[PDB]
Amino acid sequence: NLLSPDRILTVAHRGASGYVPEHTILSYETAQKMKADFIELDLQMTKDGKLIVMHDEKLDRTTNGMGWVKDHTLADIKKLDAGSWFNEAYPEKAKPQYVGLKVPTLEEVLDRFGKHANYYIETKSPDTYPGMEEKLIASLQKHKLLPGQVIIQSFSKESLVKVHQLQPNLPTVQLLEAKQMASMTDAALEEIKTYAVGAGPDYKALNQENVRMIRSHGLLLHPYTVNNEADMHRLLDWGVTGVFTNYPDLFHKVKKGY
Numbered sequence: 001n002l003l004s005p006d007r008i009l010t011v012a013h014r015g016a017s018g019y020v021p022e023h024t025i026l027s028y029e030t031a032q033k034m035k036a037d038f039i040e041l042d043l044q045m046t047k048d049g050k051l052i053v054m055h056d057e058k059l060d061r062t063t064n065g066m067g068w069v070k071d072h073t074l075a076d077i078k079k080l081d082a083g084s085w086f087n088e089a090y091p092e093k094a095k096p097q098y099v100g101l102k103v104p105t106l107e108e109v110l111d112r113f114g115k116h117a118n119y120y121i122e123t124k125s126p127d128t129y130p131g132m133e134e135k136l137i138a139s140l141q142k143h144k145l146l147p148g149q150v151i152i153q154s155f156s157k158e159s160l161v162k163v164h165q166l167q168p169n170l171p172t173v174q175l176l177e178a179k180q181m182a183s184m185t186d187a188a189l190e191e192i193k194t195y196a197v198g199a200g201p202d203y204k205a206l207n208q209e210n211v212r213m214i215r216s217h218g219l220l221l222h223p224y225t226v227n228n229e230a231d232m233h234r235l236l237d238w239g240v241t242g243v244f245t246n247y248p249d250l251f252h253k254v255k256k257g258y
């Protein structure tokens with residue numbers, strides 16, 4: 001099954017974001033067609049309390065809007081162009097159909113794919129957007145998704161502990177920045193295992209030894225953000241159990257050898 005350590009998972013990071021503007025319905029659809037195991041979502045909360053999918057706290061990078069998501073209503077956000085930025089940033093990858101792509105709500109992504117997709121969803125520290133975890137859980141329940149159907153990822157330990165006590169059968173993954181992974185110990189991994197099924201470190205901090213160490217605690221191991229073929233091979237040879245990639249078709253091809 002999806003949470004088996006012997007299964008290698010393709011997590012399409014913000015969808016097929018290497019080819020399609022990140023965190024759009026089209027990006028996720030493309031990831032699905034490319035046979036990704038999971039589509040990956042980041043959440044922000046609007047002024048009127050709605051969960052939308054966006055990586056940054058600000059609209060600036062990926063829309064023609066400006067400012068903090070939480071200062072804008074959903075209605076105004078839905079007017080924005082969340083695709084043209086990609087054509088500008090990567091002119092060699094530009095496509096006319098990317099003009100006018102919209103920011104989706106969490107609700108729209110879940111409604112779009114239902115049980116036909118598996119979702120890898122980020123939460124924030126609970127103080128960032130109060131009630132985010134509860135709204136997320138309720139949205140998942142609405143679409144009858146509450147395993148491996150949904151994995152919750154977060155840098156925030158408190159968020160994952162909260163999730164784990166609210167929904168004990170909702171798999172979580174502790175995200176780890178480079179320096180955190182650099183100084184990882186068996187004790188810390190043992191702590192992580194009490195609420196999380198896996199770890200998700202910056203892949204740059206990985207080597208054979210600490211990969212073996214994470215694996216020794218029976219934890220899943222999904223480094224981010226792995227886009228280069230050479231790195232895919234090295235990490236799989238070391239023993240990671242999946243990756244976050246912007247190029248899910250490439251990783252699909254590579255992992256067949258492992």
Ligand SMILES: [Ca+2]
Pocket residue numbers: 013014040042224244
């Ligand atoms: Ca991510």
Ligand code: NA
Pocket residue numbers: 059060061062063064065085
């Ligand atoms: Na912009």
